[PDB]
C-alpha cells in the first residue's frame, strides 16, 4: 500500500526453522514470512520445501510494495539456504547479489554442552 | 636508548590542528635529546573499517629514540587528545630511516 522503490531480502535460517524478511536498505521491515507459518510444524517446519513455500509467501505478502531489485543476505547453516534464494527469485525478483552474513564469534562465548543420544 | 615507531591516526575534522599537535610531540623528544630518524605524512587514507563511525582518517608516522619515561608521557598525552583515535607505539630493534612503503607507493 506504499512504495519504497527497492528492497533487501534477509533469509534468517535455523536448523529448527527458516525466516524470510523483505526490508528496505534502511533496515525497516516491509514484509515477512516464516517456514513455520506456512502450515508446516515440527519436522515439516524444517525442510527445503517449507522454506520454498515461505519465500513465495513473503514475496506475495510484500508484492503490494512493488519491490523489484533486492539484495539477498542469508544467515544460518540450516537447510533451505539456497532453496529460499531460488523460490524468491520467482515473481521476477531481480537479484543483485547474495552475501553470507552468518554470525562467527572469534572464540567469544561458551556454547551449550554436547548432547548425549 | 630505545627506538620506537609511532603511527597515530587523527580525526579528519582536526587535520588542520595536526601540524600544531606535532610540536609538543617533537618537543618532548628534543628536550630529552632524543633523536628522530623518520617523519612521514601519508595524509587522509580510506579506512578498511569505521572508527567511531569515521572514515578518511589522517595517518602520521614517527620513528623516535628517547628515554622510556618520555615515551610513556607521550602515550598519556595521546589518550588525553580527542582528535586522535588510534595510537600505536612499537619498539624497533634499530632506527629505520628508509622510505615508508606508503610514501614509496604515492
Amino acid at each position: 500500500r506504499k512504495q519504497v522503490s527497492d528492497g533487501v531480502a534477509h533469509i534468517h535460517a535455523s536448523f529448527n526453522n527458516t525466516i524470510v524478511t523483505i526490508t528496505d536498505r534502511q533496515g525497516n521491515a516491509l514484509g515477512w514470512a516464516t517456514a513455520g507459518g506456512s502450515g508446516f510444524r515440527g519436522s515439516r517446519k524444517s525442510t527445503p520445501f517449507a522454506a520454498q513455500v515461505a519465500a513465495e509467501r513473503c514475496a506475495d505478502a510484500v508484492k503490494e510494495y512493488g519491490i523489484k531489485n533486492l539484495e539477498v543476505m542469508v544467515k544460518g547453516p540450516g537447510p533451505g539456504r539456497e532453496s529460499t534464494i531460488r523460490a524468491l527469485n520467482a515473481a521476477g525478483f531481480r537479484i543483485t547479489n547474495i552475501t553470507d552474513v552468518t554470525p562467527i564469534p572469534h572464540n567469544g562465548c561458551r556454547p551449550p554442552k554436547k548432547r548425549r543420544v | 636508548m630505545r627506538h620506537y615507531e609511532i603511527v597515530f591516526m587523527v580525526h579528519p575534522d582536526q587535520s588542520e590542528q595536526v601540524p600544531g599537535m606535532i610540536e609538543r610531540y617533537t618537543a618532548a623528544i628534543t628536550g630529552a635529546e632524543g633523536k628522530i630518524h623518520r617523519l612521514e605524512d601519508w595524509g587522509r587514507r580510506q579506512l578498511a573499517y569505521p572508527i567511531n563511525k569515521l572514515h578518511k582518517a589522517h595517518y602520521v608516522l614517527m620513528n623516535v629514540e628517547a628515554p622510556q619515561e618520555v615515551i610513556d608521557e607521550l602515550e598519556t598525552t595521546f589518550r588525553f587528545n580527542d582528535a586522535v583515535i588510534r595510537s600505536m607505539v612499537m619498539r624497533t630493534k634499530h632506527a629505520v630511516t628508509e622510505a615508508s612503503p606508503m610514501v614509496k607507493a604515492k
Binding site: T99, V101, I104 | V7, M9, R45, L47, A48, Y49, P50, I51, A57, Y59, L61, R86, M88, M90, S100, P101, M102, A105
Partner: protein, 65 residues
C-alpha cells in the same frame, strides 16, 4: 612459495599492504602456510604484521566490517 627467502627480506612490514593483501582471503582470513608455501619463521611474522595492520585499520578483520 617462501617468497620471503628468495628476496631474502629479513623483516616483514605491517605497512606494506601490497604484500599483506596477497596473504589475506576476500573473507579477510589469513591464508595457511600449507597453501601459500611460506616458511614457518615468516608465516609467524606475516600473522603478526597482518594483525598489527588490522589494528591500524589498514586491513579488514572480516569481509563485512
Amino acid at each position: 612459495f617462501c617468497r620471503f627467502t628468495a628476496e631474502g627480506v629479513q623483516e616483514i612490514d605491517y605497512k606494506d599492504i601490497a604484500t599483506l593483501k596477497n596473504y589475506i582471503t576476500e573473507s579477510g582470513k589469513i591464508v595457511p602456510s600449507r597453501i601459500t608455501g611460506t616458511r614457518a619463521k615468516y608465516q609467524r611474522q606475516l600473522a603478526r604484521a597482518i594483525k598489527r595492520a588490522r589494528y591500524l585499520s589498514l586491513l579488514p578483520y572480516t569481509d563485512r566490517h
